[PDB]
């Protein structure tokens, strides 16, 4: 009740009437955390299809979802008549052939942040047997634990006024000389007309 502009409403992602009442025409993000089988991978069947319906009704809307199984991440935004996304299946099979644990990695929705799986937290716990700091680092980045004097994860847009900084190293130099911020990485976007 103390937070500004936090509202609630009754409905679901499968009810288009409720979604239009929420303001989905004016929504930057639509986060779906909906929870709903004997065959294991079918547990996400309702969430995948419901999200797919909105992907077709609102193609420009940004939908972020959580899936039980990383194998189901290929079904986030499914273009069956798309040779590129169908070729990604061959790439992921090759990576699975070489024994890579990150085979879902090259799926477009995961790479764009549209999907993540909760099985990753399992890997975080197993990693903690070797990296006792890993849980603490993750929560510090997520802001889950707040230590006085510890930084927070943010993002900066590189607009056309900042292209005179040609490379990522020069951006590291400029940030560390003015605001003392440390770049973790880049979120890159390319033109990929489908």
């Amino acid at each position: 009740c103390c937070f500004p502009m936090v509202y609630y409403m009754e409905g679901s992602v499968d009810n288009l009437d409720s979604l239009l009442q929420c303001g989905i025409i004016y929504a930057d993000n639509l986060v779906v955390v909906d929870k709903e089988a004997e065959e294991d991978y079918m547990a996400d069947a309702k969430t995948i299809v419901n999200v797919q319906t909105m992907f077709r009704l609102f193609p420009s809307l940004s939908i972020t979802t959580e899936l039980t199984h990383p194998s189901n991440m290929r079904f986030m935004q499914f273009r069956a008549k798309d040779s590129y996304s169908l070729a990604l299946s061959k790439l992921e099979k090759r990576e699975r052939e070489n024994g890579s644990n990150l085979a879902f990695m090259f799926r477009l929705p995961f790479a764009a942040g549209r999907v993540f799986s909760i099985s990753m937290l399992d890997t975080l716990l197993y990693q903690s047997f070797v990296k006792d700091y890993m849980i603490t680092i993750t929560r510090l980045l997520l802001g889950l634990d707040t230590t006085p004097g510890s930084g927070y994860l943010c993002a900066m847009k590189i607009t056309e006024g900042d292209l005179w900084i040609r490379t990522y190293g020069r951006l590291f130099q400029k940030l560390c000389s003015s605001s003392a911020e440390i770049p973790i990485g880049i979120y890159r976007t390319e033109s990929h007309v489908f």
């Binding site: 065959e39 079918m42 309702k46 995948i48 299809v49 319906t53 189901n72 079904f75 069956a80």
Partner: protein, 293 residues
């Protein structure tokens, strides 16, 4: 020039082979079978060397003769043309028989354990993906699919997550359908189960909705997921999807052939009210028959 039983050292070579199997293959039960042959070889090879050397004092058996003597012994044939004629040779046969009867069964039980836990083609096939396969659905496909002479060289792979039905099992045991129908327990959503089905080589894939399920939206979601999984794995495989609810029909529009059950059911029921027995007319037309009834 002293006698040293180097032949018993062959047993240790078998042990050195057992620890080999733990690390590299070169086939899970094949290794124990190979081990079983090894201890059989050690059993025989110890028998030949022991009998040949102990008979060196009496009757002076050759190695080839003792090998034949040993083989007909552990096979319980016991011809008796060549027998141990001295007490230490007779005793060695006794302890070799006893050693055989206490070593071989241990290998047999390890074989039995592996076999128990293990218990739990040509070209131009088609895959049939269902959630539960019943005899009514299977025979309808089999009657229609093999009513054509062109598709007689085809075999059918059934990819179904559920365990094979008892009624379905009996029909598959029939020699007509034994060689034509393979039943795979697996999911279209697991690429490994799609590799076992050879979906990348299948002539066609039939994704059929489950109508017995009380939740038809859930069933339609599963077939949409199955159709996507097959399209993702094998893009150049014609999909034949059976959809229950019309609202879910545009999610599988990419499929080569889609049948919506609710549309056809209610349009035929409505036409029966306009044109009597339109459902009967359509039914006979879509059934392959020679007009001999």
């Amino acid at each position: 020039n002293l006698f040293i039983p180097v032949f018993l050292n062959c047993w240790l070579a078998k042990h050195a082979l057992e620890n080999m199997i733990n690390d590299f293959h070169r086939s899970a039960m094949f290794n124990q079978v190979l081990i079983l042959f090894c201890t059989l070889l050690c059993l025989v090879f110890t028998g030949t060397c022991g009998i040949q050397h102990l008979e060196r004092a009496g009757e002076n058996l050759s190695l080839l003769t003792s090998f034949y003597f040993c083989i007909v012994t552990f096979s319980t044939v016991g011809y008796g043309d060549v027998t141990p004629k001295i007490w230490p040779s007779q005793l060695l046969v006794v302890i070799m028989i006893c050693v055989a009867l206490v070593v071989l069964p241990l290998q047999f039980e390890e074989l039995v354990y592996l076999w128990m836990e293990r218990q739990k083609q040509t070209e131009k096939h088609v895959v049939l993906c269902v959630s539960s396969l019943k005899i009514d659905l299977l025979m309808d496909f089999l009657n229609e699919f093999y009513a054509h002479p062109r598709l007689q060289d085809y075999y059918v792979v059934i990819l179904c997550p559920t365990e094979m039905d008892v009624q379905v099992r009996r029909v598959l045991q029939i020699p007509l359908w034994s060689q034509r129908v393979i039943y795979l327990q697996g999911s279209a959503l697991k690429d490994q189960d799609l590799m076992r089905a050879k979906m990348d080589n299948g002539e066609a894939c039939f994704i059929l909705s489950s109508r017995n399920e009380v939740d038809r939206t859930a069933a339609d979601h599963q077939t949409i997921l199955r159709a996507w999984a097959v399209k993702d794995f094998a893009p150049n495989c014609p999909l034949y999807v059976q959809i229950l609810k019309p609202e879910n029909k545009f999610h599988v529009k990419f499929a080569d052939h889609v049948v919506c059950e609710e549309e056809c059911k209610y349009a035929m029921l409505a036409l029966n009210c306009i044109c009597p027995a339109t459902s009967t007319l359509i039914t006979l037309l879509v059934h392959t028959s020679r007009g001999q009834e």
